[PDB]
Design a binder for this molecule. Structure first.
Ligand code: LKF
Ligand code: MG
Ligand code: ZN
Length: 312
């Protein structure tokens, strides 16, 4: 069904740009991922029936929550595609293979609940996974799908390479734990400014891949303002539903997850953009200068939040 999809020609041109919004093409998302895989890895990387069976299985294991959903999977994959494209050489074939599958799988089975929640209100997942709670469960969900019948898209690789790619993926998914991000950036900014950053160093590499994942995970802030506005509505809904359950167990949530304090959201993003996004895409533009448009967009959206602050 999926397997004879062919992407529209106007979309072949625009999918290459950073600001591209997948949003209005819901039925084309599976075929846009397939297209994106073929363009970056080639038409022959996986067996089509294996890929399409996997791609649809992933989709099934994403829930109908307001933000951390199938749409967000394809969005973050797209932005990876764009970075990989604009910096093709730097990364290996096995990295390209893994990061796109990673971005597409990185929130597999999200419920709308932060690590923080799952840990406080003592839940199984926090039981099994002490830290980066959900981000582990996502990688687990990735492998259970990878090991369904006819779903193992990697089976034509050696054991050696199957366990390299799965590492790349594990690392990547885990790194989308925004908790881990902040310390990662600081190392990169330093490794950069001290003339010492060496893409050849495996450990330096994984950090950059890490920073890449966070640039991708957050890339909603790098789209035209109306799309960015509308997406924040989607996360904050998810955040608010979370905050309501803290209220139903007699605990005030942080303002961010309290729907009654929605006035403060503009300042919340103003911080998040200053504390996280601007620095995120600023270290990324230093390491990979062809990703500059991402920092460009972030800044435009910052002043929109700043504008909203002062009555405009
Ligand atoms: C729900 O997790 C809370 C405990 C803490 N927290 C909230 C965030 C957070 C905030 C404020 N905004 C985003 C965010 N986006 C920024 C708004 O547009 C959508 C993407 N993505 C991921 C995590 N985000 C990161 N950590
Ligand atoms: Mg996540
Ligand atoms: Zn995500």
């Amino acid at each position: 069904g999926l397997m004879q999809f062919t992407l529209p020609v106007r979309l072949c041109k625009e999918i290459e740009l950073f600001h591209f919004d997948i949003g209005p093409f819901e039925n084309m998302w599976p075929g846009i991922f397939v297209y994106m895989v073929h363009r970056s890895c080639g038409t022959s990387c996986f067996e089509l029936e294996k890929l399409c069976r996997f791609i649809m299985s992933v989709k099934k294991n994403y829930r109908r929550v307001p933000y951390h959903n199938w749409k967000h999977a394809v969005t973050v994959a797209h932005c990876m595609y764009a970075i990989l494209q604009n910096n093709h050489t730097l990364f290996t074939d096995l990295e390209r293979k893994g990061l796109l599958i990673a971005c597409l799988c990185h929130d597999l089975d999200h419920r709308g609940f932060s690590n923080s929640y799952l840990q406080k209100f003592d839940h199984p997942l926090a039981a099994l996974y002490s830290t980066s709670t959900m981000e582990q469960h996502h990688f687990s969900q990735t492998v259970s799908i990878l090991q369904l019948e006819g779903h193992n898209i990697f089976s034509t690789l050696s054991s050696s390479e199957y366990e390299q790619v799965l590492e790349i993926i594990r690392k990547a998914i885990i790194a989308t734990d925004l908790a881990l991000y902040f310390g990662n950036r600081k190392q990169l900014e330093e490794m950069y400014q001290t003339g010492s950053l060496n893409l050849n160093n495996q450990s330096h590499r994984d950090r950059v891949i890490g920073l890449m994942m966070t640039a991708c995970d957050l890339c909603s802030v790098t789209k035209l303002w109306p799309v960015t506005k509308l997406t924040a509505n989607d996360i904050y809904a998810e955040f608010w539903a979370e905050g309501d359950e803290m209220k139903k167990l007699g605990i005030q949530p942080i303002p961010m997850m309290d729907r009654d304090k929605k006035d403060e959201v503009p300042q919340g993003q103003l911080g998040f953009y200053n504390a996280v996004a601007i620095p995120c895409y600023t270290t990324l533009t230093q390491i990979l200068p062809p990703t500059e448009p991402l920092l460009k967009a972030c800044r435009d959206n910052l002043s929109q939040w700043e504008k909203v602050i002062r009555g405009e």
